[PDB]
Design a protein around this ligand. Structure first.
Ligand SMILES: [Mg+2]
Ligand SMILES: [Mg+2]
Ligand SMILES: [Mg+2]
Ligand SMILES: [Mg+2]
Lengths: 423, 423, 423, 423
């Protein structure tokens, strides 16, 4: 009854890129409130609902989605138990009636899903990660921090999209964060000393004019050494190839847009293997196309036992696609994007599926984020052991790391930081 | 009883630039908590306390400030009424006993001061702006958004540090903020069209390689038009010359470090005058040096009637320097930085001193900010009518804008957005 | 729930002069009540509703206003949040339908408005001044006490209406009030020694049979001296000339009704100038006619820099009139009378308008006062720094001074008494 | 326990004549507070404690008394049940040690006493009169209003000190009060037509220059008639002869300082005797000296059966003296002054004694009053049927009338207004 939902409101706020997004606030009978927001980054995912009014926000308004929260969703949810998130989510899914949340907007629906969970957690007097994962929630994730950018929207000749450091050697999340910031500032000073730009992209990382993937890797490795740390022992690398952007002439053929290098599906795999022998890269995301299933199969045989192979575009947090990958032995990890699926409970299910099949779940940010820190709690709640939420600059990134500090603090001696054992 | 402070804790979190800063949490007897943080950006201002340990965060840790909260400050404040913020602040000021808050750290002191205010507001069931400014608080501020950077650490030939748009034609903050994003994205596209860089600096704006202050201005004005808005009627401009960084051979002489142009104060002033006749510039911050008092007095005679002259370095949120300026007719506006003075109540006093004198008070962010949105509430609480808190990108900036949204919603018909009348 | 208005009731009480006025009591769901009253003394002002029945109170009954509260206004406000005084005021204003609150009666509307603020404050567990102005409220006002009377309804040859002392030398309101009482008794002892009447007028001040303004001033200056204080250092004088009572044959001409002395606007101004050079007079209310705008413009030019020129009849607490004053540079202060405008929220706006334009706002009593002490809180709430509320005798006057004592005490060290800096 | 006194504080406030007096606030464990103040006007009464510092308030400060409350009284009453007023008063009396409350100050003691009673009632959720007098309290008093002043401090030739009107014909206190105000304004008008002074003295009444007691009486009777009322039916008269100020050459002789007329004790009685035959005078206070007991005994024989003879100076609210009067059949009424006896309970006992013996008890103000309205509730709480609290002007007087309006309102149909039957 103190957990009974009284009213749900929506509002149009601005995300970290200067575009609108949806925020929801859930009010319970006891006067407790919860607040959630939808981040923003397809055909196999939930579709966020935008206004399309060219006279407002360049067509990116979300007043329609907001109106859906304020009228339909509120009426639907009023009277329900906010702690029963599965039932709340299901009421929204059934009322929406589509397969992709396109009536209400995946952004309206997620924002309310999160807001409720936060309302229930607060009403129960527990942290959100304890609400979501219970006493069994005690793993702090190893972050992969995207500190060097290439790919489609970077001003350089680097084809791979994200270059990430993972502090596998630290023994607390607090230590891992500190070290990451130290490597980050080392990289900045190094870029500066070489006359390169130290301004940042969407996820807080640098996008200097380097020659290639290899040079980017060596800049990062140098940054690591400059900060006083050892590649392999202290830091290893993860990458997001986003090779779905490298479409060649036909399936199984790849052309890097900048390098202009051409790869057979199986030669790309050979490329990844040489990169991984040369350098301490332990994870690669989207190392092949979102539909090169035959390729993924091969790559996972060839590399799966040593390298984490994360499906991002391959899976789009879709459990039918996750299942197909599991069954055909493609990938061994999945990038979890709350908003691609659209509800808290559906996300838990997706993560449960991955974990059951021995896949890791890397909880993920989007390019368009907010002050919201839900994914921090979510990663701990399900002991995912990994998170991808940006360089340690821009507070829509750093806010998640701060939340993980607080959580680690709160867990006391029960807190576990898995380091290299996390893969 | 229920407003009685039971305990104060601190923690080392990370700011928007990847450097440590202080967070405080205040716990009241009634179970309510409040959280505050210190932003980070001299000799006449309160001093932030850093650890200096090169092994941690390159010497920028704040574990000492945190230990000052956890022990000394908590013991001092326990038992005190959290709603009596003036008294809370005085207890910290007196127990510190320095002029620059260098015993506890101005960052430790500010963090606690904000956390108390937030705890008290929460315990009373009122929003922070109402706690700070009561029923009388209903003016939303006109933002000056720094979307184009020059000066110091910019990769360009522009000497002026910050070029800012102000949405003076809007009739609500919500509309003003929408328009600002629209101009933001139009500028981004303009820069892209001209092959310029659209990654961002600390405050979320672009630092493309532009040739002169004049060119920066025209790009912004072009952007305004592209967005569908008129210079003058919809948007005007504010700049931060930061002209203390233009020291000359003698006092009264200036040398722009990029331009290399030489001015005597009277000439520099005359320079500002031309710019202000050519372009819709309505405010210039630090148009002369932080000790060129005669020039300030002169400039204020020449310009103060038509242009807003903001003392940033001139005053360092210092009420002695402000008073001096007031007494000598220097400036007609002051940039208010919570952390330059170090407590909430002292900041109210600075703002009250300015207002009594007919100076405007521009509530301001620092280059290092966090998820904290206190300045949003502060701006509304004292009806300052102006806020300087960044481009509409990076959530440590945008979170403030989002908070002002929520506040405008909350005020309803009582909300006032002053636009062009705010000056 | 607990701030929700359940019921509003009105009653007919008696003011300090022995005439009826309106009292309101607001009842909230939580069990809390608030009590407010309307004081009383036009065409540009809100209009009080009197009954007109010569059978009762000589036509000055207020049972119609009281019935407006018990029925229409109670029905309208029931269910509303008493802390949203802007919304409450607005509902009343809109239901009334008139531009001057003539339907419900401005006495009815103000009474309820005050009663709600008091109810809200009490429900939130804060002093009225904290509810109105928040933490930012800490300025005790300098009183101008009307201890010697002339003008229309005084039996003496003195044309100037009010002669006031202001304790500018004191360091606390406590000290200030004490000195005021001491000068008050000294003057009485002086009048007694000269065979003059020491009975009191409406506002607690003496109306002894003196020859002229100049003599009145010299007696007060003598009282000051007798009491042990120095004119200038300790006490200065304020006057209300009420020169709208001095209308000449044509506009721009004045004839003092007793004196019979004649003036041109520009002549009357030189008269004030000399009085101010000769004596320590720092403020003059209505030094020119309520419609002699050109003369006010000129007077403000001539005297404005040295003297406070308070518009009372000039502005009638009307924002349109105050704005006209501001645009045409007439006066530099405004006498604020709650009941002339008729609601708490509109009074805040009027004061805000004044402060934004550099005018001071003197919170003021009416000739017909009650035990109510709202103006004491209002003055501290908006840090006006000045209050005009009678001689230190008669409890409808002294009650306010007593409330200021309690307020100062409650502020502890945060209390500011601006003494001479208030101007 | 919620009725337990936690803390008692005192404060120096200002009374209706501009002189300092004591206020007390009592704080109960449950968070409720009560406020009480001592009014101020001898050898047989309790002695108020003044500071005597000639450098403050002309020696009339009460900081010593206030410190007695803040330390000693507070320490003694802490932990006691505030509803047990008799015990609270006893604790204070015993701690004081003196017979006249001279150590703590009758002013400090009474202030606390009243504050507790008020706090207790609030804590119980009952009006003060119900607290004091229970369900049995429902008689509104008949007011005797001093609208014409003579005797000592008066610019006239009237020897009788107070001339009072009593609305005996009214059917409710509301009607009575209204009629009184109307007579008051008629007298003012009448007085003006005769060029006579209409400023007021301490108790809100006029002191014009009239020649004799008979004149005063006729003016009042004239006023009554002008207002539209009949002497006898609607209004009768009461008088405070204050004959103790007429000390003769020896006990039993009287000399009117103004008339210079000489009287033997028994001749004076004959004088009153005629007056009452000539005029509708139903009550005379202190018609003989405060020690002329044989006189009183005689007067009481002569007049007692037709006329109310009130002992003011005769009894000074002292039960020993009241008992003596009762035993020697002197007077048939007593003027009750709280601050003469010094506590609430002792006051109740005085009234109970008078009531026991068939005296009427007239609850009285002092010349130095405050916003406090305690005596209104006291009068109803003990169904005294009569109150003496001033002309209907000056809110230290009118506040009592207003409180009686509220009480009558709160009583609904159970309210009894006795009128003529009250004697
Ligand atoms: Mg990807
Ligand atoms: Mg600056
Ligand atoms: Mg006036
Ligand atoms: Mg007497």
């Amino acid at each position: 009854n103190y957990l009974e939902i009284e009213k749900v409101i929506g509002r149009e706020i601005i995300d970290s890129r200067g575009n609108p997004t949806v925020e929801a606030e859930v009010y319970l009978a006891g006067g407790v409130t919860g607040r959630g927001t939808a981040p923003s980054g397809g055909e196999f995912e939930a579709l966020e609902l935008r206004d399309g009014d060219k006279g407002r926000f360049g067509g990116k308004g979300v007043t329609k989605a907001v109106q859906n929260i304020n009228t339909e969703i509120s009426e639907i949810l009023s009277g329900m138990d906010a702690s029963d998130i599965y039932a709340v989510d299901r009421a929204m899914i059934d009322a929406d009636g589509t397969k992709d949340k396109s009536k209400f907007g995946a952004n309206a629906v997620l924002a309310v899903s999160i807001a409720c969970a936060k309302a229930a957690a607060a009403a129960l007097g527990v942290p959100l990660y304890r609400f979501l994962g219970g006493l069994n929630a005690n793993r702090l994730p190893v972050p992969m921090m995207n500190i060097l950018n290439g790919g489609a929207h970077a001003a350089n000749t680097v084809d791979v999209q994200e270059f990430m450091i993972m502090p596998v050697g630290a023994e607390s999340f607090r230590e891992a964060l500190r070290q990451c910031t130290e490597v980050f500032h080392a990289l900045a000073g190094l870029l500066k000393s070489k006359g390169l730009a130290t301004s940042v992209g969407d996820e807080g990382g640098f996008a200097p004019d380097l020659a290639s993937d290899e040079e980017a890797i060596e800049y990062i490795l140098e940054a690591v050494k400059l900060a006083g740390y050892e590649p392999g022992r202290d830091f290893v690398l993860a990458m997001d190839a986003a090779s779905s952007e490298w479409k060649g002439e036909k399936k199984g053929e790849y052309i890097l847009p900048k390098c202009k290098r051409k790869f057979a599906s199986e030669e790309l795999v050979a490329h990844w293997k040489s990169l991984c022998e040369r350098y301490p890269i332990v994870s690669i995301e989207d190392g092949l196309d979102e539909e090169d299933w035959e390729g993924w199969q091969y790559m996972t045989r060839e590399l799966g036992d040593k390298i984490q192979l994360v499906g991002d575009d391959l899976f789009v947090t879709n459990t039918e696609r996750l299942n197909k990958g599991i069954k055909e032995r493609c990938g061994n990890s999945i990038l979890i994007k709350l908003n691609q699926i659209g509800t808290v409970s559906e996300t838990l299910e997706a993560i449960k599926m991955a974990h059951k099949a021995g896949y890791t779940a890397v909880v993920s940010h989007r390019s368009g984020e907010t002050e919201d820190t839900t994914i921090a709690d979510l990663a701990v709640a399900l002991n995912t052991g990994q998170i991808k939420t940006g360089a340690p600059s821009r507070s829509e990134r750093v806010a998640k790391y701060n939340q993980l500090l607080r959580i680690e603090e709160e867990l006391g001696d029960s807190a576990v930081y898995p380091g290299f054992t996390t893969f």
